[PDB]
């Protein structure tokens, strides 16, 4: 395995999907 | 395994660390 940001729990991964939206914020403003 | 956001490549993981800073942007403004 190279590298991975683990989460642990269903809701946990999902939480990271929204966390990715926030990333977009930077790429935006 | 629950879930994980894989990357693939050293620089690749690192890139995601900066990607996490961008996340902070949302939690900020």
UniProtKB/Swiss-Prot annotation, chains A, B:
Changing residue 4 to I: In a sporadic cancer; somatic mutation. Changing residue 5 to P: In a sporadic cancer; somatic mutation. Residues 1-29 are annotated as: Oligomerization. Changing residue 10 to H: In a sporadic cancer; somatic mutation. A motif (Nuclear export signal) lies at residues 14-25. Changing residue 22 to T: In sporadic cancers; somatic mutation. Transmembrane segments: none annotated. Changing residue 12 to L: In sporadic cancers; somatic mutation. Changing residue 27 to H: In a sporadic cancer; somatic mutation. Changing residue 7 to V: In a sporadic cancer; somatic mutation. Changing residue 12 to H: In LFS; germline mutation and in sporadic cancers; somatic mutation; impaired ability to tetramerize and undergo liquid-liquid phase separation. Residues 1-29 are annotated as: Interaction with HIPK2. Signal peptide: none annotated. Induction: Up-regulated in response to DNA damage. Isoform 2 is not induced in tumor cells in response to stress. Forms homodimers and homotetramers. Binds DNA as a homotetramer. Interacts with AXIN1. Probably part of a complex consisting of TP53, HIPK2 and AXIN1. Interacts with histone acetyltransferases EP300 and methyltransferases HRMT1L2 and CARM1, and recruits them to promoters. Interacts (via C-terminus) with TAF1; when TAF1 is part of the TFIID complex. Interacts with ING4; this interaction may be indirect. Found in a complex with CABLES1 and TP73. Interacts with HIPK1, HIPK2, and TP53INP1. Interacts with WWOX. May interact with HCV core protein. Interacts with USP7 and SYVN1. Multifunctional transcription factor that induces cell cycle arrest, DNA repair or apoptosis upon binding to its target DNA sequence. Acts as a tumor suppressor in many tumor types; induces growth arrest or apoptosis depending on the physiological circumstances and cell type. Negatively regulates cell division by controlling expression of a set of genes required for this process. One of the activated genes is an inhibitor of cyclin-dependent kinases. Apoptosis induction seems to be mediated either by stimulation of BAX and FAS antigen expression, or by repression of Bcl-2 expression. Belongs to the p53 family. The N-terminal and C-terminal disordered regions undergo liquid-liquid phase separation (LLPS) following homotetramerization and activation. Post-translational modifications, such as phosphorylation or lactylation affect the ability to undergo LLPS. The nuclear export signal acts as a transcriptional repression domain. The TADI and TADII motifs (residues 17 to 25 and 48 to 56) correspond both to 9aaTAD motifs which are transactivation domains present in a large number of yeast and animal transcription factors. This is Cellular tumor antigen p53. It comes from Homo sapiens (Human). The chain holds residues 326 to 354 of 393 of the full protein.
């Amino acid at each position: 395995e190279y590298f991975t940001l683990q989460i642990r729990g269903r809701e946990r991964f999902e939480k990271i999907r929204e966390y990715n939206e926030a990333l977009e914020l930077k790429d935006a403003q």
